[PDB]
Amino acid sequence: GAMDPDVRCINWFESHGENRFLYLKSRCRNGETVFIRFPHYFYYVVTDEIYQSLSPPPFNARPLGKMRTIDIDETISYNLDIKDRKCSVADMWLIEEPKKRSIQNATMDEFLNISWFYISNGISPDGCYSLDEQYLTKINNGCYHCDDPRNCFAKKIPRFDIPRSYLFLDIECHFDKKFPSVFINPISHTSYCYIDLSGKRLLFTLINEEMLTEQEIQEAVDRGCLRIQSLMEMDYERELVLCSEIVLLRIAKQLLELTFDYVVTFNGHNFDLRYITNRLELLTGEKIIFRSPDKKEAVHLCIYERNQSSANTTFHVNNNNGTIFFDLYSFIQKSEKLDSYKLDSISKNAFSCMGKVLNRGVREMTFIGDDTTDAKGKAAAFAKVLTTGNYVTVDEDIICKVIRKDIWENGFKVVLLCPTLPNDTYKLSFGKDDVDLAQMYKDYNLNIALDMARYCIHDACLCQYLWEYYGVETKTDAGASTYVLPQSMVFEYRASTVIKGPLLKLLLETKTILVRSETKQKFPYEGGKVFAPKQKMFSNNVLIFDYNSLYPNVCIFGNLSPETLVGVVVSTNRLEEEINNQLLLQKYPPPRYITVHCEPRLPNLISEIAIFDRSIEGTIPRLLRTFLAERARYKKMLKQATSSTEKAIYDSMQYTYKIVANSVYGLMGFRNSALYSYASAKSCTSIGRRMILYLESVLNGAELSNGMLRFANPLSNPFYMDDRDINPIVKTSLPIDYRFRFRSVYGDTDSVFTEIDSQDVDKSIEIAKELERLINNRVLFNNFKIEFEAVYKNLIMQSKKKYTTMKYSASSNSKSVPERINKGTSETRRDVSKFHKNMIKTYKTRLSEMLSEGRMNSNQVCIDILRSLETDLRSEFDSRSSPLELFMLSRMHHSNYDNPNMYLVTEYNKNNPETIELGERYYFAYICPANVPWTKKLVNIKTYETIIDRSFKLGSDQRIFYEVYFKRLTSEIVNLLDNKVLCISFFERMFGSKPTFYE
């Protein structure tokens, strides 16, 4: 009977016909669903003079107030004769039009119609409301129309929780050597995970019969599978169903046409759904059809693309029914920087626990995880993935099938098919998987079909596990709130599109319009500025300080905005440069104006100086000021809340305000952006770079003696003359006995690393906290702050991307467990041999001790540790006392896409009593004839790969091919070294080749 008028908006979407509409999908507190339809207008902003002139009048119009319109075109000047920036005031109108309309000098055209809908009717995209039924007329069951949303939506109310329905899916298509093509390859599986409004999970997988034997099909039935002959016969409470391809496909079409809230895949948009759809057209005639909630519009499922250069392409579904088709692969690429975007890597990082041993021996380890084993609920998360996980990875490398599992709400007990090395504790991960589909299809039979079923369901369920892990539901809503956009458009549109809502709201609040009256000349700002450590290896501890949101703070500090730019003064010679600099300082003094040297924009210019007026807060800085404030609010809300559902919501909001603030720098330099401003962007970079150098100049060589911190240079404000005490000698609250010395060791865009001559992590943290305080009170000024993050012990670092250290955090003390930090690496467990590991471990421990002596050039360390390598190496090549064991390496056998490895294992199987089986882990070594001498050439070191089985004995007329191991080893050693020229001379002489340095 009666509609619940209490609704929570969950998506918004549009139909596109000649007769088009905007639709809302909302969820009521009971659980019912209400679609509401609204007429589509196109919005235009005009000046009052244009308004009065209009051919026929607009359908509707609301006044906007007086608004300043400002010319933000950027001009350079070769002297100080800088014309004032053009500026007019006028009453403005927001006009509505049911047809598209060309209005000769309409303004604010960059902003989106949908944004105007929300702003103009006072509707928040994710709001809860008590609808005013007076303004709704029903039209289907469940679908109402609303001519007056401003009044209908007038009673906003607080957020109530709602249930939501999900379908997560994955498919498996047959193939042998080429990538599966819809014209030739059938779908072999379709797996589905349905989460109901109740929270109940339903799992079901359809298996393609036509790829099995009539006997096999009957075995499946006997074994407990259901077999069905048509769509009508499907029973969704059956986890395993066999049917024909056409049935399977008709079943997908039925599911995909349903109005789930979310349909969720990993690369489903470009692969899985494309394949289902095309394969369905092929085998029957049929389309997958979506309909608007009032049945007025019907579209056939058609995947479309969106492009965005700096770059990758994303794929999207064109459903007009309110369902959010969400591809985690696109999303994870937009929201994270990672080395791999393969599902196995993404799973490895996201889902891991610490596993305490319960049994050893046979070919079966066993572990337990719980609150007592890692951290509160880390095992609960792991247990939830295990419900369908088939392969756990142990200790980073040992992939091993599950055998049994016990699961409860907080822990798991799992038994696995691995080797043995039983330390009391080990790390468990759901990552890589030693499965060769191409082989599986080649030998396909019932048991393999069931194995794939188990794999396919797990990939579908990984989509729900990842969806919980990345918090996509709340990120979507936070996105919608903040960007003033439909939930479904939040992770579809790009960074330049999403900034526009909040920007528009600000332009309205500040009664300001920004107009570029010219074609933008071409230049971005980037000059690829990359940062290299003063040295790689650290004997002493290293202090880590982060600037707090440097670039947003730079823009605020300088009042950097396209309209606060007074002008840009350039010079081609030193006389003009000097004259201009002295006129600058008279005409645009501080502190009202800041003047910023930038990298000049033309090759003939020796100087370029952007001048900003800080008297009236500019658009961009105020935007950022809002974003930072809102983030702070939410971080506090996140700690004042206690319900974990609320924590998730406030964490997402907080995150969204981080992301959007961080988008602003790039957007200032991107020419298709509403925030583009060459000078502002360049100036932001320049001011930031200067803050880094200032902080570094001050700490580099700074010392702490008595209770005084002697900074290495005065505390002078680098941009202009200042109120503050520049005295670099500064009272500290540290112990008088402390005597320490500091070195600026690395620094980048937003971070600064300070070596301290001490290994005492307890004291290193005590001092750093005090450095933090003095840096913020005396060194820095206005809104520039750092924060002490952590101490890094045994830092070895190569870049910001590739580094290794033990990290004792700010919270930390001397004796808590560090955090092993690895980054950018590729090795361990049989990429590299025990001879290499044992040598690297030795050559490090000796090098760290050479740095604690203090008695070094670059070259007195370097000569000494390279002499020592020639000695140890020539010794091993002559004395040859090291077991063959020490040079063995591993690998997994599998089929192709690898190629000369198949020839390697084949020939071993073809010539030897044993067979290395197709999912087996086999040892190898670099072996050559003993009559080969020291070799400075090289070749296909693949020829010398020799499978070492259990029988194998080294020929009397064979040797370990030491060179291969040595070259790889001196490589790792010369990248520990700072003297580069010495290292290359060694490597050419010893190996006839030129070494790689990780640049």
Numbering used by the authors: -3 to 306, 314 to 900, 904 to 1005
The study reports:
Poxviruses (members of the Poxviridae family) are large double-stranded DNA viruses that replicate exclusively in the cytoplasm of the infected cell. The enzyme is a member of the DNA polymerase family B15 possessing DNA polymerase and 3′−5′ proofreading exonuclease activities. E9 alone was shown to be distributive under physiological conditions (adding fewer than 10 nucleotides per binding event) unless bound to its heterodimeric cofactor D4/A2012. A20 links both enzymes, and the DNA-binding properties of D4 are believed to increase the association of E9 with the genome template thus rendering the polymerase processive.
Here we present the 2.7 Å crystal structure of the full-length VACV DNA polymerase and the characterization of the interface between E9 and its processivity factor subunit A20. E9 crystallized in space group P3121 with one molecule in the asymmetric unit. The structure was solved at 2.7 Å resolution using the MIRAS method. We observed the classical palm, thumb, finger, exonuclease, and N-terminal domains of a family B polymerase in an open conformation. Only 10 out of the 1006 residues could not be modeled. Three poxvirus-specific inserts are clustered on one side of the molecule, corresponding to insert 0 (aa 67–82), insert 3 (aa 572–610), and insert 4 (aa 708–743), whereas insert 1 (aa 208–233) is located on the opposite side. Insert 2 (aa 356–432) is located on the back of E9 in the exonuclease domain and forms a little 6-stranded β-barrel with a greek key fold. The helix of insert 3 forms an important contact as it is bound in a hydrophobic cavity of a symmetry-related molecule mainly comprising residues of the exonuclease domain (i.e., residues 190–200 and 227–233). The temperature factors indicate a high mobility of insert 2 (which appears to be in loose contact with the body of the polymerase) and of the thumb domain. Still, for E9 electron density is visible for all the C-terminal residues.
